[PDB]
Amino acid sequence: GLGYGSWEIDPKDLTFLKELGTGQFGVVKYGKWRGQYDVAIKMIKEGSMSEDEFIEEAKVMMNLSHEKLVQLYGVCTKQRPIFIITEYMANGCLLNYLREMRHRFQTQQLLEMCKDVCEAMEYLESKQFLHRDLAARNCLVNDQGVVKVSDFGLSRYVLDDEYTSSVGSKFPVRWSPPEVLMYSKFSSKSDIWAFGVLMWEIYSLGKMPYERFTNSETAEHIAQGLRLYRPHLASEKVYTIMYSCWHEKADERPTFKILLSNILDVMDEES
Numbered sequence: 001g002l003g004y005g006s007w008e009i010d011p012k013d014l015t016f017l018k019e020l021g022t023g024q025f026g027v028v029k030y031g032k033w034r035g036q037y038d039v040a041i042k043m044i045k046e047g048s049m050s051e052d053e054f055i056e057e058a059k060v061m062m063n064l065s066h067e068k069l070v071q072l073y074g075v076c077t078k079q080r081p082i083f084i085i086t087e088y089m090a091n092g093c094l095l096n097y098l099r100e101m102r103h104r105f106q107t108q109q110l111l112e113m114c115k116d117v118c119e120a121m122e123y124l125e126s127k128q129f130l131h132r133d134l135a136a137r138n139c140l141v142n143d144q145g146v147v148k149v150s151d152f153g154l155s156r157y158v159l160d161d162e163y164t165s166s167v168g169s170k171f172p173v174r175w176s177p178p179e180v181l182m183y184s185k186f187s188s189k190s191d192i193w194a195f196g197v198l199m200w201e202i203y204s205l206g207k208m209p210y211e212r213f214t215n216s217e218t219a220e221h222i223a224q225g226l227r228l229y230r231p232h233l234a235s236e237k238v239y240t241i242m243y244s245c246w247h248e249k250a251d252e253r254p255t256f257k258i259l260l261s262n263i264l265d266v267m268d269e270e271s
């Protein structure tokens, strides 16, 4: 209504129900919008985000719509902290989900998780939109076990420089290709590399990539042409797909469309 643009939600329409956790931007809550609709409410800690730049970009993010992307519903920005309102995902963060051994996942389930993410990424790629921090910790799981990609592009608005370059102590070194670590060259192909590492995370049931190495040691390892190796649960065909994401030459890495076709082929052959 009056006083709100299409990207703006009236915070008075929110009912807060439960705290979900605390991330780098602060607290996230579960609630309802207009008494009925489940939402996640991210309360952005003062000084953590380039808020004006994010708000302008939220207008673009609003129009990203794909079943395997966690939907942005709008922002509450008349205030502080500002809120980001998104789709609620009842089963939480993929990294934590993978690590719960009770699930006793079949490999077909793991491949489906990879396909969920690959469909989201193929969509983003078709819109020339980079994730820039793809990893299991940025995927969420709904009450039907569907995995969706979250926080696409959001790293661009982080003000804490520990996160923002390879010079930083919290940069995602373990999900970065050599050209990012060496030269800060981000591209579709750095998302492709990260996706291969995510596949590895899924098939490893949430192990940290390069688990015995520091970030520094990982960067060395990678730049010397060495790689993660095959998780026990990955068939040779699945390993070929994730490994293809790690070509030293970025242009020799597949597209998300090609990865999706490869994943579908393996599903058909392994079903």
Ligand SMILES: *CCC(=O)Nc1cccc(Nc2nc(Nc3ccc(Oc4ccnc(C(=O)NC)c4)cc3)ncc2F)c1
Binding pocket: 019, 020, 021, 022, 023, 028, 040, 086, 087, 088, 089, 090, 091, 092, 093, 094, 095, 096, 136, 137, 138, 140, 150
């Ligand atoms: C792996 C990184 C991570 O944890 N990320 C993250 C945490 C909280 C919220 C958030 N955004 C977000 N979350 C959700 N839903 C959701 C559902 C369940 C859940 O798990 C959980 C909730 C409360 N308490 C615990 C716990 O272990 N207590 C001891 C676990 C977390 C989040 N939907 C949409 C979102 F955007 C991301």
